[PDB]
Amino acid sequence: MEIILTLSQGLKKYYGKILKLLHLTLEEDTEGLLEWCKRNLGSNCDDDFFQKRIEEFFITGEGYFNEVLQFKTLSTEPFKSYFAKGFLSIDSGYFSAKCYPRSSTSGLQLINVTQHPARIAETPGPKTTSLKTINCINLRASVFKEHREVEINVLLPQIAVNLSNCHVVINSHVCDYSLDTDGPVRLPRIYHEGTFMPGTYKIVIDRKNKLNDRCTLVTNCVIKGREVRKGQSVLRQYKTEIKIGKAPT
Amino acid sequence: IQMTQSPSSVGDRVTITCRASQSINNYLNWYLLIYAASTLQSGVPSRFSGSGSGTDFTLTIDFASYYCQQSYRGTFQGTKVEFKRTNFYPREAWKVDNALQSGNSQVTEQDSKDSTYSLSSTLTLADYEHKVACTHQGLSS
Amino acid sequence: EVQLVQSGAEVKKPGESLRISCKGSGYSFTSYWIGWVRQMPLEWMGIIYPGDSDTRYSPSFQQVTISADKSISTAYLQWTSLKASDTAMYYCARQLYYDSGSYYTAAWGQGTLVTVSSASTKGPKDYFPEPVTVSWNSGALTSGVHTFPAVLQSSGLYSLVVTPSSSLGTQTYICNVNHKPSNTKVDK
Ligand SMILES: *[C@@H]1O[C@H](CO)[C@@H](O[C@@H]2O[C@H](CO)[C@@H](O[C@@H]3O[C@H](CO)[C@@H](O)[C@H](O[C@H]4O[C@H](CO)[C@@H](O)[C@H](O)[C@@H]4O[C@H]4O[C@H](CO)[C@@H](O)[C@H](O)[C@@H]4O)[C@@H]3O)[C@H](O[C@H]3O[C@H](CO)[C@@H](O)[C@H](O)[C@@H]3O)[C@H]2NC(C)=O)[C@H](O)[C@H]1NC(C)=O
Ligand SMILES: *[C@@H]1O[C@H](CO)[C@@H](O[C@@H]2O[C@H](CO)[C@@H](O[C@@H]3O[C@H](CO)[C@@H](O)[C@H](O[C@H]4O[C@H](CO)[C@@H](O)[C@H](O)[C@@H]4O)[C@@H]3O)[C@H](O)[C@H]2NC(C)=O)[C@H](O)[C@H]1NC(C)=O
């Protein structure tokens, strides 16, 4: 029955649970964390506890904080450090993420992902768009030939961009981290008056390392069409396969 | 969640061991005398030494009471280490006419001169005022 | 240097509320954890951070309440309803990487005796509260004298000798007993 956790192990397990609730990881390693919490923190670690910690870190933030995501009330050596760093290294051991605390721009960017639109059925659009040309409204593409690097700026986070045989690093205004799992890119979600997801993320790819030679992004592109009266909710949806391979000409 | 429930002279430099129910790394701070299961506190004589691992520890050597503590939940057993000679020594030591009495009813520190103990038992009981009496290593019978 | 001074001994009745204190000096009273430990006539009770703090009561041990005021650097241990089982000594202790080398350090006060009993102050067998002082011939006989510790009886009252007829027998009975709580001086 011995499930004693060391401080680093317990912290990694807490971070794994945080990542799981952020929907960045599908798994967690947390066995023995209830007693670890009740012993090294003094409070219960139920779901509500985690929700409130993530809330008060990313929203309703209060000045200084510690590595366990605890703040010092409002006004101003274990957890009693409360050293507001520029970042927090949420590392569970299985997946790392550099999460940023609240400011004046992260509070402006918090949207409430609580519903979802109906997009458009499927406009007769092409599936073999390249990188240079896009013309999408949800997608912006930057190519730094000086670094052999590609930034894929997305403007519509609800529209997914599944990766395949790819190794990317997405930088958000809430948390920067790298993704290698093929499929939908996973973004953090705080439940605070609803589920809150970041307003935009950026997908950087290093074309140097041949790691993303076979990298294919299947995504959805948005372009206005014809209007029966006004372009009132003019149609704008068609699937597309974007290739990153270093194919000349 | 169980904790340390399994543990363990005439100027004899001795040693007290201890165990536990689960692994506890190397703390068992002994009392302040020794922490980190071996480290000596500033102001403690060097004749006290600590050793061992989570399953069992040892403390090797002022005759008084001692024992250890865990640094997780639960923490702290007590052993008493003073005994010399042969009022009486060592420490380990009612018949009314109607069997042993329903009316069952019911020691000093080691004397600093002869290293002996003094014990007293009191039998509290009216209507009797029956008619008729109150074992040690030094006694053959 | 660092010093911990506890509140005086408390004699209360069952059902009465009680609050004992521990004041620290020679240190900030904000970084080194401070805890209470019970010893019935050692059982770890609780710990809290000295500055802004929650509380770490021992499992199952938590009905008492431990608190602290950092404005006066004073920790408190309180009972809402005392039981006879709470009669014991209570030690406050300041204490300084994981569990080891951390807050359960036991880096102590003089101890606070708490006696829970419905009995009232009475001189002596059957006296309350402790202590009584017993001498022989006003302190003239010490060789062979053994004064036993008091034993709490079921009635709630405390109760508690020198040794040949060839040893210059003169007196046929002596004892000088003093009970200052009830101001009794008895010569037998
Ligand atoms: C990147 O990868 C993601 C994840 O796979 C992918 O998102 C998925 O896109 C597909 C393709 O459009 C979409 O398709 C449905 O998949 C679900 C299984 O999740 C399945 O139920 C669907 O079958 C039809 O029925 C459902 C229920 O009605 C429809 O919602 C759906 O649109 C399908 O088409 C029609 O169904 C009836 C027909 O009368 C009508 O309601 C209507 O006409 C509708 O058009 C497809 O296989 C996934 O869509 C949603 O499906 C269920 C519906 O219950 C939801 O609960 C899911 O949460 C989901 O939102 C969609 N999401 C997934 C799989 O999670 C992207 O398309 C990929 N990007 C690309 C390809 O660029
Ligand atoms: C955020 O988007 C919404 C528009 O959808 C809007 O404000 C949000 O409204 C929803 C729905 O009322 C709020 O979610 C509620 O939270 C309360 C908390 O007590 C719950 O009781 C609610 O449950 C009931 O409502 C459900 C609504 O779907 C019903 O299904 C049912 O009757 C439930 O009993 C519900 O969960 C949400 O908290 C607000 N969000 C905010 C931020 O106010 C507004 O347009 C958007 N706000 C923005 C952009 O700031």
Residue numbers in the entry:
A (entry chain C): 255 to 330, 345 to 517
B (entry chain B): 2 to 9, 14 to 36, 46 to 75, 82 to 96, 98 to 107, 136 to 142, 146 to 158, 161 to 179, ...
C (entry chain A): 1 to 41, 45 to 65, 67 to 100, 108 to 118, 120 to 136, 160 to 195, 198 to 200, 202 to 226
The authors write:
Crimean-Congo Hemorrhagic Fever Virus (CCHFV), a tick-borne virus from the Nairoviridae family, causes hemorrhagic fever and death in 5–40% of cases. The GPC includes two structural glycoproteins (GN and GC) and secreted glycoprotein 38 (GP38) containing proteins that also can be linked to a mucin-like domain (MLD) and one non-structural protein (Nsm). The role of GP38 in viral replication and pathogenesis is still being elucidated, but GP38 is essential in the maturation of CCHFV particles. Additional studies have observed that GP38 may be secreted or localized to the outside of infected cells and the viral envelope.
Next, seven human anti-GP38 mAbs were isolated from a CCHFV survivor and, in doing so, identified two new antigenic sites on GP38. As with the mAb-c13G8 complex structure, the binding interface was well characterized with a comparable interface surface of 776.5Å2. The first is LCDR3 which partially interacts with the N-terminus, and the second interacts with α-helix 2 of GP38. The third interaction is the HCDR3 which interacts with a larger hydrophobic pocket on top of GP38 and the large 20 AA flexible loop. The overall binding interface is conserved through the two antibodies with minor differences between them. Through our work we have established the structural and biochemical characteristics of GP38’s antigenic site I, with a mouse-derived anti-GP38 mAb and a human-derived anti-GP38 mAb.
